[PDB]
Amino acid sequence: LVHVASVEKGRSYEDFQKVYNAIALKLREDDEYDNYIGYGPVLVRLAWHISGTWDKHDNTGGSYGGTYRFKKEFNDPSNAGLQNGFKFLEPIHKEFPWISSGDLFSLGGVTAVQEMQGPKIPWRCGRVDTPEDTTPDNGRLPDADKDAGYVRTFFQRLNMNDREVVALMGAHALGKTHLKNSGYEGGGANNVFTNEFYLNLLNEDWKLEKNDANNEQWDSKSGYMMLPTDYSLIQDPKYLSIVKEYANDQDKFFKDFSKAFEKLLENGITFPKDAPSPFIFKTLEEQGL
Ligand code: HEM
Numbered sequence: 001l002v003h004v005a006s007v008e009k010g011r012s013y014e015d016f017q018k019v020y021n022a023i024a025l026k027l028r029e030d031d032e033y034d035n036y037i038g039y040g041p042v043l044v045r046l047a048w049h050i051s052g053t054w055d056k057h058d059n060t061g062g063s064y065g066g067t068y069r070f071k072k073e074f075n076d077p078s079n080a081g082l083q084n085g086f087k088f089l090e091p092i093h094k095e096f097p098w099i100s101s102g103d104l105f106s107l108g109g110v111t112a113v114q115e116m117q118g119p120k121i122p123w124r125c126g127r128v129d130t131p132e133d134t135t136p137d138n139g140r141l142p143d144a145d146k147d148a149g150y151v152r153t154f155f156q157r158l159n160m161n162d163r164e165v166v167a168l169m170g171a172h173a174l175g176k177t178h179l180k181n182s183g184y185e186g187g188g189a190n191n192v193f194t195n196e197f198y199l200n201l202l203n204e205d206w207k208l209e210k211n212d213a214n215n216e217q218w219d220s221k222s223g224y225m226m227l228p229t230d231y232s233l234i235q236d237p238k239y240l241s242i243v244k245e246y247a248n249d250q251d252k253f254f255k256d257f258s259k260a261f262e263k264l265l266e267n268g269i270t271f272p273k274d275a276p277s278p279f280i281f282k283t284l285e286e287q288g289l
């Protein structure tokens with residue numbers, strides 16, 4: 001099962017920068033969503049959930065086919081709340097109907113990270129929409145009520161190693177949990193990409209509490225929370241070393257996140273040798289827009 005990247009006909013960097021800009025301008029303008037957090041975090045989660053269905057064993061799932069647009073995947077309980085991200089992107093897709101669904105969903109994630117003052121994420125085009133029968137079954141996305149061994153084993157299916165996992169999890173500095181979506185509540189209202197997830201893990205006094213959905217979570221008196229899978233990163237000696245590394249080196253974290261996030265968004269895709277190089281998009285700020 002091979003998925004070969006195919007560039008949208010006649011399109012080049014400038015076309016994709018236009019799409020980036022449209023997403024970035026809407027992120028700035030539609031700023032009241034989720035108590036003024038904005039749509040950045042939910043776009044990051046959407047890009048991860050469309051990618052995180054991949055299975056390295058048979059090359060099913062992943063970002064290539066844009067299958068989140070079909071009912072089976074859209075309605076996966078694990079995807080509850082992402083409809084908000086889809087609705088955000090819908091007018092963009094109407095304005096740029098030539099872009100594939102996988103390209104749009106993945107570019108939304110890249111745009112969000114960069115516009116939230118995160119690292120540059122190189123991005124490649126050429127995902128191609130595939131038919132409804134290629135949609136993966138529900139149940140490929142991870143549970144939150146588990147431990148370090150579960151997280152490690154889960155991420156092996158996505159060909160991620162312990163450094164890649166710890167780096168990717170740093171996205172949990174962003175946004176929050178919502179009881180009605182996932183049965184976890186809280187996290188505050190951060191929409192700036194930093195290494196604070198690692199600093200919070202190490203520095204806060206965490207208490208194991210039960211929330212209103214009868215699930216356990218780790219809460220601090222400062223008002224922060226960690227999922228059981230978040231907290232597992234300081235329970236496992238290998239993960240803990242890496243958490244300490246990122247808490248102490250913002251730049252290293254940015255660089256490792258950039259690589260892991262690009263890999264996540266590209267898993268399963270074969271790029272021909274004559275495909276364009278990855279694009280690095282300018283932010284609105286870099287453009288003076
Ligand atoms: C073991 C792996 C993971 C688990 C169990 C997990 C679980 C969750 C849960 C339960 C939520 C709350 C959803 C809601 O209530 O609205 C969430 C939110 C989020 N996750 Fe993850 N996640 C994992 C990995 C990741 C990865 C790898 C990324 C990105 C690189 C990511 C990015 C996000 C973001 C940005 C949000 C916030 C969404 C919002 O504010 O609407 N997560 N995650």
Ligand SMILES: Nc1ncnc2ccccc12
Nearest residue numbers: 172175176177187225226
């Ligand atoms: N803001 C968050 N802090 C800790 N863990 C999380 C897990 C999921 C989403 C947001 C957070």
